[PDB]
Symmetry: C3
Subunit: 102 residues, 3 copies
């Protein structure tokens, strides 16, 4: 399986996007939590509150998930970071595989 990390400007957009992803079953679940971001943007260091999202899904769904997030994301250049899971308990992996599209 894989973990996908992305960030949103607010709770409204984060919740809307994540719910759509769940409805389309591109992910089995998401963990949302606030954070403060500091980043470079056109010659200036920006500071913004964001809602970070940890999405969990199947490895084979990466491409489709990434594309969908791109179409739904409020940011023009969002962060869609994929981290492969080296191992996970099989009983959980089963639930995840079962709850994701196939």
């Amino acid at each position: 399986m894989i973990i996908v990390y992305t960030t949103f400007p607010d709770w409204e957009s984060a919740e809307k996007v994540v719910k759509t992803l769940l409805k389309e079953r591109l992910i089995a679940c998401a963990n949302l939590r606030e954070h403060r971001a500091f980043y470079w943007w056109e010659g200036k260091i920006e500071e913004d509150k964001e809602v970070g999202a940890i999405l969990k899904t199947r490895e084979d769904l990466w491409e489709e998930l990434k594309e969908r997030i791109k179409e739904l994301h409020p940011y023009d250049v969002p962060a869609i970071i994929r981290i492969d899971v080296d191992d996970v308990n099989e009983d959980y992996l089963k639930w995840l595989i079962e709850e994701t599209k196939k």
Copy 2:
């Protein structure tokens, strides 16, 4: 070393489990913070407040740690995710090894 990510339904269970893992020297430490979870569960997209836990330990302790968490976890199907650390400062690694059993 490795990082292990798991979630709990509340702070009570999260603390109990983490402290048990520490007393048994299966992990060097943990980072816990709340998050809003959205997931599929028997035909419904559940929304709940959870406590996410980031555990740090040695690679050779993974299996034993995974099985121990399965026994202690309040969730019937908990997420026990392993992510290998590609590199880390040496002093921290040495500290982590000294803190974990064997």
Copy 3:
């Protein structure tokens, strides 16, 4: 690209360090959020509020970044954890590499 995870004792140090790393373009950005750390100290399990920081940068900047964090960090034995990113949207990766030193 890679993600580097470290923790700080407070927001003052977290933001000062992160802003310095950005100014020197060792990272493209960072996400900071509080958490509760659990670890052994003085013979017992201690709980401490910390500010976790997720930094995003290029793989080739790892060594320089790690050494810089060591020089700036308030902790004597800080956690400087590198986790390689398996995949990421390429428009974000293009942005990230163009904002970091070289």
